[PDB]
C-alpha cells in the first residue's frame, strides 16, 4: 500500500501508463488510471513522464489519480519520483529508458517496415480460406499496391490450440504460402494462448500441466495440487489458457510456432490476446505471478520471432516487438487518436508502433466515409509502419483511391528517412514518431496532438477533419513544405488550403 | 415430498429403476437408488416391478430405499403402487408397460440385428481416420467375419458441435462410405449434444439461443433474459450444451444429422452423452424441464433415425431405440453383468438391448484374458444384438479366434428366432431376452442371473467363469441341448462338461 503524492510544477504536463488512454492526456484534474490487472485494451507500462523532465517508475503496477494539481499514486510494490536535470520531456524519456527499459539493440523483421502491411481481417472476417486469401493478395498487386507482410487473421485453424491450417478451407496451405512468397509477400498468422477446452490439444496441455489452474477460491490450494483448468471468458467464448509463467508452456508454444514455420514456410505471428484482464480471478500459476506479468510473458514469445505484432502488452519497452495500436472504429474521433497514441507508445519504449488498420480495425464499424479512409491512410503513411485491411479498391471511388495510392508513394519517397530512424531506435530507443513536445520542448506544443515529427527534421501535419483549411503550428526555424517547395518562417501558426490529396509535411531548413 | 412405504410380501423380490444397478438386485436391505438427476451411467426409468405382480410408477424421478423388509419411495412428483392379479413378474411388467410405456409398433433398423455390429473405438481410439477405418473393415472381411453395422466412434470431426469429417484424417469421406457400403457395411457416426465453447458452432448456437443458459445461481433470472451459456464439465472437458427442451435445438440437430446423411450417405448415429447428471446446477432451459427430461428428450432424437444407439436414457420405454449397456471393463465381474443388466433393460421397456462391446468397452482396460473375450462373445451371441470392437484376430490365438467365429455361426443359425421375437417386441413390448423369473415364476429362479430365455423356448446358459464345469438350473419340463440332442428332465440342476467352444443352449420340448 505504498503511496506517493506529487504536486505538479507550474505548467507541468504528465503522460504515461497506458497507450489507449493517450487521448485523456496530459492528465487533467479528475483523471484516473488503474494498471493493476488492466492494460486498457493495448500496451501499458508503470511509467509516467513530465514536460519538466520528471518521471515516475515502479517495477510493478500502480494506480494514478490527479486531484486538483496533485498526483496520487498507489503502488502494488514500490516506486519513486525522479528528475532529469535537462528539464524536458525528452530528458525524462531518455533517463527513464536507460534506467528501466534500455534499448535491446535489435529490430523486428525489416519487411514489416519496408512495405505497407495488409491484414485479411476486414475483407474476409471469419471466412479465412485459401482462395479468398490468394485473391486478396492478387488484388493488392493488380491495383498497383506494393507487396508486403500479409497477416492471415483469426480462424485459419480448426479450433483454438490447434496450430494447423483447416484442410476444409486450405487444401494446399504450403502451396498457398509458396505462391504468396513468389508474389513478394511475407506471411504472418494470428495466434493466441487460448485452448478450446474439450479438445485433444486441451487434454494434452492439461496433462502436461501447462495451463493455468482453477484455485477454487481456496486461499491454500497450491499450483502443484490443482487439477482443474481455469476457464476464461473472452470475446470468442470460453477457453482454457496457457500459463505464461510455466517454462513448459514456452516449450509447447515454440513447438507449435516452429512447426508452422517448418511445415508451411510461415514468416511470423500476430500475437493477440494476452490482455492482463484475462488472468484475473481464481487462478493459479506455476511461478505465482500477477496478471500483468502474464501479459508481459506472452510478449516475450515475440523475442523468438523477429516478425511479430502485439496489441496487448505490459512492459517490454526497448524490445524488438511491433506494437499495434488497438482496433480503431471507423470514426473521425478514432483517426484523431492515432498520433497521440503512437507518440505515447514511443515514450513508453514502443518505438516500432503501427497505428492499427487504415479506415478502422473494428469489423462491426463495417455508410462508409471515403474521406475518412483517405485521411486514415495519409496519417499512417509517415508513421513507422502502415497497415491496410479494408480493400481501398473495393470501397473507394477513383480519386479517393488515387489519393490513397499517393499516400503510399509519399511513404516510399520518405522510406530512407523512416528506416534511418527505425534502425537508430533499435540502438538508442529514441522514437521514430516523436511528439512536438519531445523535439520542441517548452515552445507551446504540450497539447499539439495533430502534428508529429518523423525523426528530427520532418514535421508531418495530416489533415484529420473535414474542410479545405488546415492550421499548422510551426516551431521557430524555417520550414519547407516538401510538395509545394514553399519556405515558411517558423514560430507562428499558418493556414494551408487543402484538398483530398494534401498531406502537409515540412522539412526543417533552419 | 410424497412417498410410499411398502412392506415386502413373503418371498417378494423387487427390480427396477436403473439398468446399471441390476447386479445389486433384487433390492436388498440397505439398498439406495437416486434417479433424480442420475441415470447411473446408462438407462433409467421410474418403475419398480416385483416377483409377486406388484409395481410402482411415477411420471417423474424418485429415490428408492429398502430398509429391513420395507421398500420406501420418495417422489419428486406423485406415484402409486399397483398389483397385477396374475401375481408374477411377467404380469407386473405387462400391466406396467400397457399403462405407462406401451410398445410403439416400430423396430430400429433391422441391419442392427441381422448381423454383428462393429465399433472402431477399441482398435482406433481417438485416431479415427479414413485409412484405418477401411483397414478394419477389410480385416473383418478377410478374417471371415460378416459385414454389419460399423460405428465410427468419437473424434471423426474437427471439434464438438462441428458435424463434418475432419479433412486432415478423411481426404474423401463420401468415397470411404461408398466403399464401406459396397463391402456390405452400413455406417453410423458418434454424436453428442456438447459444443466446443469458443468456436464458430458455439457462437452460432448461442446466437440462436439453442444452448442451455447459466442461471448465475439467481432464483429470478428467466431463460428469456439470460445471456451466458451453461458450461458443463464432462469426461472430454468443458463444453456448452444443447437445450433439448428448445424446439430450435431439435431443428439445429436435425439440420446437422440430415446433412451428414445427404452429403456423405451416413446410415445412422450413435448418440452418446445426454446423461441427466450433465444437466444439474445453475442452468436455465427454455421450457423449464428437469435434468432427467433433458436426457429423455435427447433420446427422442433417435425416433427420427431408425438406425440409432443410446447409452444414457430416461424413460422412452417401448420405443424403437437401441439401448446399449454401458462401457464394460475387461473383467469377469463385468461379463457377469451382461445378462441381469440386459434382462432388466427389457422389463423397463428396452427390448432392443445390446450388451456393450465384446471383451469390454472401456479403452483403459486396454494381460488380455483371451478366455474372457471368448466367453464375452458367446454371451453376446444369443442376445438381441452382438457388438465387437476389439479385433478378435489381433488379440486371440487360433483356437480362441475359432471359438468366437463359432459363436457368430450359432447366432446366424438362431437368427430367425431372434428376429421373430424382435419383431414381436416392437408390437407388444415383450422382451427378446427374458429373465428366468419372467418365464418361470415362483420356481426358485429369482436370483438366477447366469441364464436367460431367448423368447419362450430357448434357455441359454453361457459359461461365465473358468473351469470345465457349468451348473444349469432347469425349470420343470423337458429340455433338449441343441448341439448334443440330449434331453434333460427339469426341476433340478444339472452339471455339464464344457470346453472353450461350449455355449449351453436348451430347447423347451415340454
Ligand atoms: Cl473480451
Ligand atoms: Cl463425465
Q: How far apart are CA B199 and CA B221, in angstroms?
A: 26
Calculate how close chain A gets to B166, using CA atoms only, in Å.
Answer: 8
Q: In 3D, which of B393, B403, B326 has the Cα closest to residue B357?
A: B326
CB contact under 8 A, B164 and A159: no
Experimental method: X-ray
User: Of the bound ligands, which one is closest to the alpha carbon of residue A233?
Assistant: 1
User: In sequence order, which residues have a C-beta less than 8 Å from that of residue A122 and are 6 or more positions away?
Assistant: A357, A359, A360, A361, A363, A366, A389, A390, A391
CB contact under 8 A, B158 and A158: yes
User: Of the bound ligands, which one is closest to the alpha carbon of residue B236?
Assistant: 2
Torsion of CA B62, B65, B70, B76, to 10 degrees: -20
Answer for the pair A302, A310: CB distance below 8 angstroms, yes or no: yes
Between B159, B167, B234, which is nearest A159 by CB? B159
Residue A29 burial class via C-beta count within 10 angstroms: exposed 0-12, middle 13-18, buried 19 and up: exposed
Q: How far apart are CA B261 and CA B163, in angstroms?
A: 11
A375 is in an annotated binding site: no
Q: Could you tell me the distance, in angstroms and rounded to a whole number, from the CA of residue B196 to the centre of ligand 2?
A: 15
Calculate how close chain A gets to B201, using CA atoms only, in Å.
Answer: 11
Q: If you write DSSP's letter for every residue of B314-338 in order, what string do you get?
A: ES-TTSS--EEPP---SSHHHHTTH
Phi/psi for A443 (5° steps) reads -130, 20
Binding residues of B for beta-D-galactose: 190, 235, 270, 272, 324, 326-327
Angle between helices A173-182 and A130-142 (to 10 degrees): 10
Between A164, A168, A239, which is nearest B198 by CB? A239
User: In sequence order, which residues have a C-beta less than 8 Å from that of residue B140 and are 6 or more positions away?
Assistant: B118, B147
Torsion sign (Cα): A17, A23, A28, A31: negative
Side-chain-side CA neighbours of residue B444 (13 Å): 9
Q: Could you tell me the distance, in angstroms and rounded to a whole number, from the CA of residue A445 to the centre of ligand 2?
A: 64
For B8-23, give one letter per residue: b (16+ CB within 10 A) or e: beeebbbbbbbbbbbe
3-state secondary structure of A325: coil
- From the CB of residue B439, how many other CB atoms can be counted at a distance below 10 Å? 21
Answer for the pair B496, B505: CB distance below 8 angstroms, yes or no: no
C-alpha distances in angstroms, B25 versus B30, B56, B67?
12, 16, 14
> What's the maximum distance between 2 C-alpha atoms anywhere in chain B?
72
CB contact under 8 A, A238 and B240: yes
User: Of the bound ligands, which one is closest to the alpha carbon of residue A327?
Assistant: 1
Residues in B whose CB is inside 8 Å of some CB of A read 126, 155, 158-160, 164, 166-168, 194, 196-200, 202-203, 206, 228-229, 231, 233-234, 236-240
3-state secondary structure of B174: helix
Q: Could you tell me the distance, in angstroms and rounded to a whole number, from the CA of residue A216 to the centre of ligand 1?
A: 22
Answer for the pair B423, B107: CB distance below 8 angstroms, yes or no: yes
Q: Could you tell me the distance, in angstroms and rounded to a whole number, from the CA of residue A222 to the centre of ligand 1?
A: 27
Q: In 3D, which of A14, A2, A13 has the Cα closest to residue A62?
A: A2
Phi/psi for A197 (5° steps) reads -85, 25
Q: How far apart are CA B229 and CA B211, in angstroms?
A: 6
Q: Could you tell me the distance, in angstroms and rounded to a whole number, from the CA of residue A97 to the centre of ligand 1?
A: 31
From chain B, pick out residues whose CB is under 8 angstroms from the CB of A168: 158, 164, 167
Phi/psi for A348 (5° steps) reads -90, 5
A327 is in an annotated binding site: yes
| Cell numbers that stand for B367 in this block | 494381460
Residue A26: cis peptide before it, omega within 30 degrees of 0: yes
Documented resolution in Å? 1.9
Q: How far apart are CA A108 and CA A103, in angstroms?
A: 13
A272 is in an annotated binding site: yes
Q: How far apart are CA A351 and CA A434, in angstroms?
A: 9
Chain breaks in chain B (C to N over 2.5 A) after: 366
Q: Which residues pair with A80 in a beta bridge?
A: A57
Answer for the pair A308, A322: CB distance below 8 angstroms, yes or no: yes
Q: How far apart are the first and last CA of chain A?
A: 51
C-alpha distances in angstroms, B195 versus A165, B201, B264, B465?
21, 7, 22, 43
Rg of the Cα atoms in chain A: 23
Q: In 3D, which of B306, B354, B271 has the Cα closest to residue B19?
A: B354
Fold of B110-426: TIM Barrel (3.20.20)
Q: How far apart are CA A430 and CA A454, in angstroms?
A: 11
| Cell numbers that stand for B17 in this block | 429403476
CB contact under 8 A, A198 and B194: yes
| Cell numbers that stand for B439 in this block | 418365464
- From the CB of residue A8, how many other CB atoms can be counted at a distance below 10 Å? 18
Q: Could you tell me the distance, in angstroms and rounded to a whole number, from the CA of residue B275 to the centre of ligand 2?
A: 9
CA A62, distance to chain mean position in Å, is 22
Optimal mutation site among B155, B198, B212, interface A, most CBs of chain A within 10 A: B198
Rg of the Cα atoms in chain B: 23
Residues with CB under 5 A from ligand 2 (ion): B 234-235
| Cell numbers that stand for A196 in this block | 478450446
Q: How far apart are CA A46 and CA B218, in angstroms?
A: 39
User: In sequence order, which residues have a C-beta less than 8 Å from that of residue A185 and are 6 or more positions away?
Assistant: A118, A137, A147, A148, A149, A150
Domain spanning A110-425: which superfamily? Glycosidases (3.20.20.80)
Optimal mutation site among A161, A173, A237, interface B, most CBs of chain B within 10 A: A237
For A82-102, give one letter per residue: b (16+ CB within 10 A) or e: eebeebbbbbbbbbbbeebbe
| Cell numbers that stand for A162 in this block | 490447434
Strands (E), A390-498: 433-434, 452-454, 458-460, 469-474, 478-481, 487-489, 492-497
Amino acid at each position: 500500500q505504498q503511496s506517493l503524492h506529487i504536486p505538479l510544477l507550474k505548467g507541468e504536463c504528465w503522460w504515461g501508463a497506458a497507450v489507449n488512454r493517450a487521448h485523456d492526456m496530459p492528465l487533467q484534474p479528475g483523471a484516473f488510471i488503474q494498471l493493476n490487472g488492466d492494460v486498457s485494451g493495448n500496451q501499458a507500462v508503470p511509467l509516467l513522464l513530465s514536460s519538466a523532465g520528471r518521471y515516475v517508475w515502479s517495477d510493478q503496477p500502480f494506480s494514478v489519480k490527479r486531484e486538483g494539481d496533485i498526483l496520487s499514486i498507489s503502488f502494488t510494490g514500490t516506486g519513486a519520483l525522479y528528475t532529469a536535470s535537462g528539464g524536458s520531456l525528452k530528458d525524462a524519456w531518455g533517463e527513464a529508458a536507460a534506467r528501466f527499459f534500455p534499448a535491446s539493440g535489435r529490430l523486428p523483421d525489416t519487411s514489416l517496415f519496408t512495405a505497407p502491411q495488409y491484414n485479411t481481417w476486414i475483407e474476409l472476417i471469419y471466412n479465412q480460406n485459401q482462395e479468398d486469401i490468394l485473391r486478396y493478395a492478387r488484388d493488392i498487386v493488380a491495383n498497383g499496391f506494393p507487396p508486403g507482410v500479409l497477416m492471415i487473421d483469426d480462424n485459419w485453424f480448426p479450433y483454438y490450440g490447434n496450430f494447423s491450417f483447416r484442410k476444409d478451407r486450405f487444401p494446399d496451405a504450403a502451396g498457398m504460402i509458396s505462391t504468396l512468397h513468389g508474389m513478394g509477400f511475407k506471411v504472418m498468422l494470428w495466434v493466441c494462448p487460448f485452448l478450446s477446452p474439450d479438445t485433444e490439444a486441451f487434454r494434452e496441455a492439461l496433462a502436461k500441466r501447462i495451463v493455468l489452474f482453477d484455485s477454487k477460491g481456496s486461499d491454500t490450494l497450491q499450483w502443484q495440487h490443482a487439477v482443474d483448468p481455469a476457464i476464461v471468458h473472452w470475446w470468442n467464448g470460453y477457453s482454457a489458457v496457457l500459463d505464461g509463467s510455466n517454462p513448459d508452456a514456452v516449450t509447447w508454444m515454440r513447438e507449435k510456432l516452429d512447426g508452422l514455420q517448418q511445415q508451411y514456410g510461415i514468416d511470423g505471428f500476430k500475437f493477440d490476446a494476452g490482455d492482463a484482464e484475462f488472468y484475473l480471478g481464481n487462478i493459479l500459476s506455476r511461478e505465482k505471478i500477477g496478471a500483468n506479468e502474464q501479459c508481459e510473458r506472452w510478449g516475450r514469445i515475440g523475442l523468438l520471432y523477429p516478425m511479430n505484432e502485439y496489441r496487448a502488452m505490459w512492459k517490454n519497452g526497448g524490445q524488438p516487438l511491433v506494437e499495434r495500436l488497438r482496433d480503431k472504429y471507423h470514426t473521425w474521433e478514432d483517426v484523431r487518436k492515432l498520433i497521440p497514441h503512437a507518440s505515447l507508445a514511443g515514450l513508453l519504449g514502443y518505438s516500432f508502433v503501427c497505428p492499427d488498420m487504415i479506415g478502422g480495425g473494428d469489423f462491426s464499424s463495417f455508410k462508409l466515409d471515403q474521406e475518412l479512409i483517405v485521411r486514415s491512410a495519409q496519417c499512417h503513411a509517415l508513421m513507422p509502419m502502415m497497415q491496410f485491411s479494408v480493400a481501398p479498391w473495393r470501397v473507394l471511388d477513383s480519386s479517393q483511391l488515387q489519393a490513397v495510392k499517393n499516400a503510399v508513394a509519399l511513404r516510399r519517397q520518405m522510406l530512407p528517412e523512416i528506416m534511418k530512424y527505425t534502425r537508430e531506435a533499435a540502438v538508442t530507443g529514441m522514437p521514430v514518431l516523436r511528439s512536438m513536445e519531445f523535439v520542441f520542448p517548452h515552445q507551446g506544443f504540450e497539447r499539439v496532438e495533430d502534428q508529429f515529427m518523423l525523426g528530427d527534421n520532418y514535421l508531418v501535419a495530416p489533415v484529420l477533419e473535414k474542410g479545405s483549411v488546415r492550421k499548422i503550428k510551426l516551431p521557430k526555424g524555417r520550414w519547407q513544405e516538401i510538395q509545394s517547395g514553399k519556405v515558411y518562417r517558423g514560430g507562428e501558426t499558418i493556414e494551408l488550403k487543402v484538398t483530398l490529396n494534401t498531406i502537409p509535411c515540412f522539412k526543417r531548413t533552419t
